[PDB]
Every structure is written in structure tokens, then in C-alpha cells.
């Protein structure tokens, strides 16, 4: 479906080289999210599979009200808007962390990044 196929363009990045704020100014421009710069944003790195697995109890658990929180820790990356401008030049400052994620899932594929936790 389309909003599984949108949580992925805006949050996954499975191989990343390098993950600091020239990644993310550089990603965020790729994945149309430069018009107007969006704010804060996370991308997951690693194989699909597993972010995909965090629909099920193979990888994930029930959080919250109909959120789900992987059972695994991932390698991601947020970027947080540096400024005030809300049109490009779009400057990010990059943090590479580490750890579980919040989705909401729809017939068993994610379709939201909680980024509360981000």
C-alpha cells in the first residue's frame, strides 16, 4: 500500500555512508523533504525485514494506545532543523543513535514513525 511505501522514502535509509549533518542535509533533499524544510526527522538503517517484523510479536511489542516498540535496538539517525528558515538551503545537524523504535502498523506493514521519541 501507498503509506507503507511513504513511511519508507521518508524513513529508511538501509546503508548509510557517513551519518552526520552533510547526510542529512543530503538525504533530506533526495527524499523531497527540503520544500519546506521539514524540522526533525529519523530515518532507520539495517534491513527491511526487521523494521518490517516489528509488526508482529517476531520483532515487536504493543506500546502506548496502537503503537507497537520493536523488541530489537536500531542504528538511526535523526535530523533536527538548524535555524529558523523554513526554505532551502535547509540546515541539519545529524545525532547517529541507537536504539528501539515506535511505529504504528496497518495490515502488517508500518506506516508511522512515532518521532516523539526523537
Known amino acids: 500500500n ?6 519508507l522514502t521518508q524513513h529508511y535509509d538501509a546503508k548509510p555512508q557517513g551519518r ?9 533533499r533526495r527524499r ?11 530515518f ?6 526487521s523494521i518490517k517484523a516489528i509488526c508482529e510479536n517476531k520483532n515487536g511489542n504493543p506500546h502506548r494506545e496502537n503503537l507497537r516498540i520493536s523488541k530489537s535496538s536500531f542504528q538511526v539517525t535523526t535530523c533536527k532543523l538548524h535555524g529558523g528558515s523554513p526554505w532551502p538551503p535547509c ?8 536504539r528501539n523504535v515506535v ?4 495490515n502488517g506493514l508500518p506506516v508511522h514513525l512515532d518521532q516523539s521519541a526523537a
Not at 501507498?2 to 513511511?7: L, M
Request: glycine share 6%.
Open 103 to 106: 511505529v504504528a502498523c496497518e
Open 20 to 28: 552526520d549533518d552533510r547526510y542529512c542535509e543530503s538525504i533530506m
Open 91 to 98: 540546515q541539519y545537524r545529524a545525532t547517529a543513535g541507537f
Open 44 to 49: 532507520i538503517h539495517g534491513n527491511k525485514r
Open 32 to 42: 523531497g523533504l527540503t520544500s519546506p524544510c521539514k524540522d526533525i526527522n529519523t
Open 2 to 7: 501507498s503509506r507503507y511505501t511513504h513511511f
